[PDB]
Ligand binder design. Sequence first.
Ligand SMILES: *[C@@H]1O[C@H](CO)[C@@H](O[C@@H]2O[C@H](CO)[C@@H](O[C@@H]3O[C@H](CO[C@H]4O[C@H](CO)[C@@H](O)[C@H](O)[C@@H]4O)[C@@H](O)[C@H](O[C@H]4O[C@H](CO)[C@@H](O)[C@H](O)[C@@H]4O[C@H]4O[C@H](CO)[C@@H](O)[C@H](O)[C@@H]4O)[C@@H]3O)[C@H](O)[C@H]2NC(C)=O)[C@H](O)[C@H]1NC(C)=O
Ligand SMILES: *[C@@H]1O[C@H](CO)[C@@H](O[C@@H]2O[C@H](CO)[C@@H](O)[C@H](O)[C@H]2NC(C)=O)[C@H](O)[C@H]1NC(C)=O
Ligand SMILES: *[C@@H]1O[C@H](CO)[C@@H](O[C@@H]2O[C@H](CO)[C@@H](O)[C@H](O)[C@H]2NC(C)=O)[C@H](O)[C@H]1NC(C)=O
Ligand SMILES: *[C@@H]1O[C@H](CO)[C@@H](O[C@@H]2O[C@H](CO)[C@@H](O)[C@H](O)[C@H]2NC(C)=O)[C@H](O)[C@H]1NC(C)=O
Ligand SMILES: *[C@@H]1O[C@H](CO)[C@@H](O)[C@H](O)[C@H]1NC(C)=O
Ligand SMILES: *[C@@H]1O[C@H](CO)[C@@H](O)[C@H](O)[C@H]1NC(C)=O
Lengths: 170, 698
Amino acid sequence: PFSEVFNATTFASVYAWNRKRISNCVADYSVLYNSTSFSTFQCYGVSSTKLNDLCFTNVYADSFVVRGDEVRQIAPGQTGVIADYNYKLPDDFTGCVLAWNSRNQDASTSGNFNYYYRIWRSEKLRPFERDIAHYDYQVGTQFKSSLKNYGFYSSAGDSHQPYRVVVLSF
Amino acid sequence: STTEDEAKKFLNDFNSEAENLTYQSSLASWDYNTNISDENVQKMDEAGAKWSAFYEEQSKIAKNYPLEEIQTDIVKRQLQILQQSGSPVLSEDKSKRLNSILNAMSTIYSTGKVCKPNNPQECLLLEPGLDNIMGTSKDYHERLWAWEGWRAEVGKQLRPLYEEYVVLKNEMARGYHYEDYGDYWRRDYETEESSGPGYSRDQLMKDVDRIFTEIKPLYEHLHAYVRAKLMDTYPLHISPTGCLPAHLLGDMWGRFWTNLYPLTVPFGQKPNIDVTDEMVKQGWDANRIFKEAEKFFVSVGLPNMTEGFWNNSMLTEPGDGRKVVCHPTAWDLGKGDFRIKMCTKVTMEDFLTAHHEMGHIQYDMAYASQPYLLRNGANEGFHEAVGEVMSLSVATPKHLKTMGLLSPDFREDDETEINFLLKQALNIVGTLPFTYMLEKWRWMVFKGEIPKEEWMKKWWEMRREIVGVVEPVPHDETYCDPASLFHVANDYSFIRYYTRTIFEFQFHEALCRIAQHNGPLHKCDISNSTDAGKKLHQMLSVGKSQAWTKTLEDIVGSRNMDVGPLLRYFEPLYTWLQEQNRKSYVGWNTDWSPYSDQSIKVRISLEWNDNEMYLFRSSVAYAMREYFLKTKNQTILFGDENVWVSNLKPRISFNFHVTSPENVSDIIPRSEVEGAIRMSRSRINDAFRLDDNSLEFL
Ligand SMILES: *[C@@H]1O[C@H](CO)[C@@H](O[C@@H]2O[C@H](CO)[C@@H](O[C@@H]3O[C@H](CO[C@H]4O[C@H](CO)[C@@H](O)[C@H](O)[C@@H]4O)[C@@H](O)[C@H](O[C@H]4O[C@H](CO)[C@@H](O)[C@H](O)[C@@H]4O[C@H]4O[C@H](CO)[C@@H](O)[C@H](O)[C@@H]4O)[C@@H]3O)[C@H](O)[C@H]2NC(C)=O)[C@H](O)[C@H]1NC(C)=O
Ligand SMILES: *[C@@H]1O[C@H](CO)[C@@H](O[C@@H]2O[C@H](CO)[C@@H](O)[C@H](O)[C@H]2NC(C)=O)[C@H](O)[C@H]1NC(C)=O
Ligand SMILES: *[C@@H]1O[C@H](CO)[C@@H](O[C@@H]2O[C@H](CO)[C@@H](O)[C@H](O)[C@H]2NC(C)=O)[C@H](O)[C@H]1NC(C)=O
Ligand SMILES: *[C@@H]1O[C@H](CO)[C@@H](O[C@@H]2O[C@H](CO)[C@@H](O)[C@H](O)[C@H]2NC(C)=O)[C@H](O)[C@H]1NC(C)=O
Ligand SMILES: *[C@@H]1O[C@H](CO)[C@@H](O)[C@H](O)[C@H]1NC(C)=O
Ligand SMILES: *[C@@H]1O[C@H](CO)[C@@H](O)[C@H](O)[C@H]1NC(C)=O
């Protein structure tokens, strides 16, 4: 709910996201409600209306630039490359997920290849754990990196456009 | 671990590295096609080189996964697509020779010229020059010059290139574990359904034979009507019983009969539909045309055009100094990028072409959710079938009336529907025997059922028997008449145009049944039909994830190709043609030719190879020269190329006739040639050391 989480110039990749711990009391949530710039504001465990008066011990905010068609994978309870090998949410989730398009900042005409995702892991990720280790994996008869970079072009559809996703955790 | 997991990992990595290269290649191709320059050729060449090298390499790894140990259908289909096409087993010199042969054939087709007999400096290319004559001229002799100069100055160049091309392509297809190149072309329609046996590659041949048998009577009646109308124009050139000459069919090859419409129109006093003036009025531009197409597709429930479609597509010719390719194409660039490149004029043809290309784009965004290998049509006919059935629904006069382009005072009588159905049939029914016969000839050329010494003989036998079209000039093995077509000289399969029409009219009948249409099928509009659009979107959503038989059964209720919807569409035209062809002869004989009545039959009675045939042609030319000098006091330089030989038995008999120099349409009368033979019989019979009894000269 802070300004520096949602207005950061550089956002983290999905495989190595940025978690920010918030323990203040300045949380009005009216900007998030009435911004009308969020493509996804659906969340679970709370009604998203009694959020202003309720208090919590700590608030954890994440940040990734996943593609448009894997914003739905940030929900709990389904598969997908982001949901399995990247950021994974537990079945009992008591936070909120916010996402918006970032074609003007994270896409270019020649392509923006600065954002990476993990294509394969040895085992599925447990909820709320992160791995940054650069390793190669085996396909066919060749060894190649497990981190593939997103191809973010300006002349691409909404499913292939960058989306800055901020996930609150209470 | 298990091979399914390894195949899934390989396919995931291939997709992740493949949308990248496909999108980069598509962007380079778009930058060339909307901005033609030498700088943009190299970028496309580089991007295509990277994509092709990646594809052949990944097919080489893809061959390492055995298909018999995969249970998931999607992985099976993706690996089948990857393993079917890749790097051939051909050696580097043979592959270089094949590439050089293909480039030579394309260059000969694109740069061949035909020069006038009177003006050697007036040489005409095919696309602006000879196509205009073949589509617009009503002169028998000019059309004969254009038809005979082509296939002689171009097809004779393409004959040895095609002879080497057949061998090289058959070797390449045998390297892919196929019987020949025809089997490799028929691999598109092969499926493995879960329930029962699937579609085979021989089943395609059996099905197209059955479909042609079913369409034979309607084509026979249309042929009889066109012959009766083409007897008025060109009198004393068409037999009432025989085949139609190949150079009077509206184009160079007789592929479409649409240019015969001014000659074969019923009820010429009735004006046809032409709303082009109504869009010159009311301020219509290209944007209005494409917005109306988008409105039509929204009316059935299909999605809107994307925001990037309206920004990135080239809907008009650029006002600045940018050279573009003015061919209407719908582009699926990848990563959700759909564009249309077309130079839209304010015309009805451009309106219907916009609806066609928007149907292509709708198919693309429907199957965009599939994996990259499966993002195509169900077979090669489905895309064009969807485009033509959208164009069929849009072009109805009721749709134009509710669009405002047609005045409410316009009344649809029975005469206007006959004109519309005949104009449709000259493009739809007239092209089906030609397509079937050309694909049949190519299939038995690749299979080996036609030997190399019978190519033209079998070509003009099946042209007479199947299409009902006779050649105006006899053609020996020096000619290559199929190679004079674009698709044959540029290595393009042709059966997609055959299957497109059948699938298109099947889809039309299904969607008009769903839309609760009660009238005749040619007056059907699927606008505002959310059920028809729902069924169509269920069809288009599965691109190649399942068999095309299952998709066809899902949309039309039948697993097989059925031409019954096509015959039901043209039923009023069939009834009218049956009523008109009561005083005419329906059908044709394969014996009449334009040169048949004036030819003299020569019997050989006894080493008569091609050299003795050249000597005989020279003797006949000398006798012609002597007769014309000593009888009519005229000098005419008859040559061996002016003596045409037909019905050549290897050593038994043949027929010959003489044509004039500088005029291939001027066949010398048979009495004059007989008098020339009887005038100079001594030299002709002394050139081969024989008497007059052995050469009968009947
Ligand atoms: C779609 O197509 C595009 C085409 O551009 C392609 O983008 C390119 O991706 C590759 C692969 O990720 C990028 O190359 C990597 O880039 C950085 C360094 O790049 C800097 O310099 C280049 C100048 O060329 C700049 O463009 C760029 O912005 C950066 O400033 C490194 O992360 C990578 O090096 C690692 O990988 C190499 C692979 O062999 C190793 O040789 C190398 O040593 C590095 O690996 C090691 O790194 C650490 C070393 O200590 C270690 O911890 C690790 O374990 C490991 O051993 C690499 O060079 C390239 O820049 C992109 N090109 C652009 C942006 O123009 C996309 O990849 C492609 N997408 C898909 C999905 O196929
Ligand atoms: C059409 O293509 C030409 C090249 O043939 C483009 O001109 C290039 O523009 C880039 C970007 O400014 C320059 O770096 C190049 O040097 C230019 N090349 C040449 C040969 O001048 C041109 O921009 C293209 N036009 C459009 C509208 O895209
Ligand atoms: C069915 O589609 C037709 C066009 O094919 C629409 O008909 C016209 O729509 C406009 C705009 O709403 C009206 O002003 C006209 O009166 C309609 N009729 C005619 C004869 O032009 C129609 O709107 C569509 N149906 C629905 C329910 O939207
Ligand atoms: C080439 O020969 C044809 C056929 O002899 C000429 O065309 C006409 O032929 C008819 C009979 O078929 C004659 O009655 C006409 O006199 C011929 N000429 C014309 C001008 O109609 C044709 O003229 C000859 N020449 C060319 C250049 O095609
Ligand atoms: C399609 O676009 C038009 C014009 O913007 C809009 O009115 C309509 O609601 C859109 N349809 C759908 C199904 O989104
Ligand atoms: C399309 O172009 C308009 C007008 O320039 C612009 O406002 C809009 O953002 C563009 N849409 C895209 C790039 O998706």
